[PDB]
Amino acid sequence: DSLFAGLVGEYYGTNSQLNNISDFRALVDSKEADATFEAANISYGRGSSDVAKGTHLQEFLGSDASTLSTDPGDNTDGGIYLQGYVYLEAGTYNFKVTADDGYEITINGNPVATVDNNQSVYTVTHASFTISESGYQAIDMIWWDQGGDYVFQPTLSADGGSTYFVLDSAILSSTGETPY
Ligand SMILES: O[C@@H]1[C@@H](O)[C@@H](O)CO[C@H]1O
Ligand SMILES: [Ca+2]
Ligand SMILES: [Ca+2]
Ligand SMILES: [Ca+2]
Ligand SMILES: [Ca+2]
Ligand SMILES: [Ca+2]
Ligand SMILES: [Ca+2]
């Protein structure tokens, strides 16, 4: 398990339709990842013409694509599963996520941002949640594209929604140890 300032990323493609969270999670369960990568700057897309075709995944992942384990072949539909840790002080936070299609983010195993359906690009300000103890918190994310356009940018606020930040190498850890 390598130590890096990012989340462990897995990409999965399929030629079946992804309509909701359950469909993507079942894809993840069904096989080994089509590619792995380091998710160090979680602000992906936008692009067009299906994330799972050609080099669209590379374009979507941008600054993280150089860590891809392989170049997946074509599929119609696809998505990502990210997992690891995020340093957060105790306090109150909320996500604001821009996405096409849907997604789910969990912290310490509890959902904190959910869109359980397909959608063209849309930004949701999610409800707040609490962190009870400062440190590295467990975090995971799924996102998918059913086809067409694709974008995924979760941002996080620690100040009641006045300012938001991207999750990146400043605060992410793949294993929960401090990355240097
Ligand atoms: O990206 C597409 C968008 O272009 C629209 O067709 C609605 O579904 C989304 O998945
Ligand atoms: Ca799997
Ligand atoms: Ca490809
Ligand atoms: Ca980019
Ligand atoms: Ca859970
Ligand atoms: Ca589809
Ligand atoms: Ca789409």
Residue numbers in the entry: 11 to 190
Provide the publication's sentences verbatim:
MpPA14 (Marinomonas primoryensis PA14 domain) lectin is a domain of a 1.5-MDa adhesin responsible for a symbiotic bacterium-diatom interaction in Antarctica. Bioinformatic analyses indicated the presence of an ∼20-kDa domain near the C terminus of MpIBP that is a member of the PA14 family, which is a carbohydrate-binding lectin module widely distributed across several kingdoms of life. PA14 domains share a β-sandwich fold and the presence of two consecutive aspartate residues in a cis peptide linkage (DcisD). The DcisD motif coordinates a Ca2+ ion that is directly involved in binding polar vicinal hydroxyl groups of various carbohydrates.
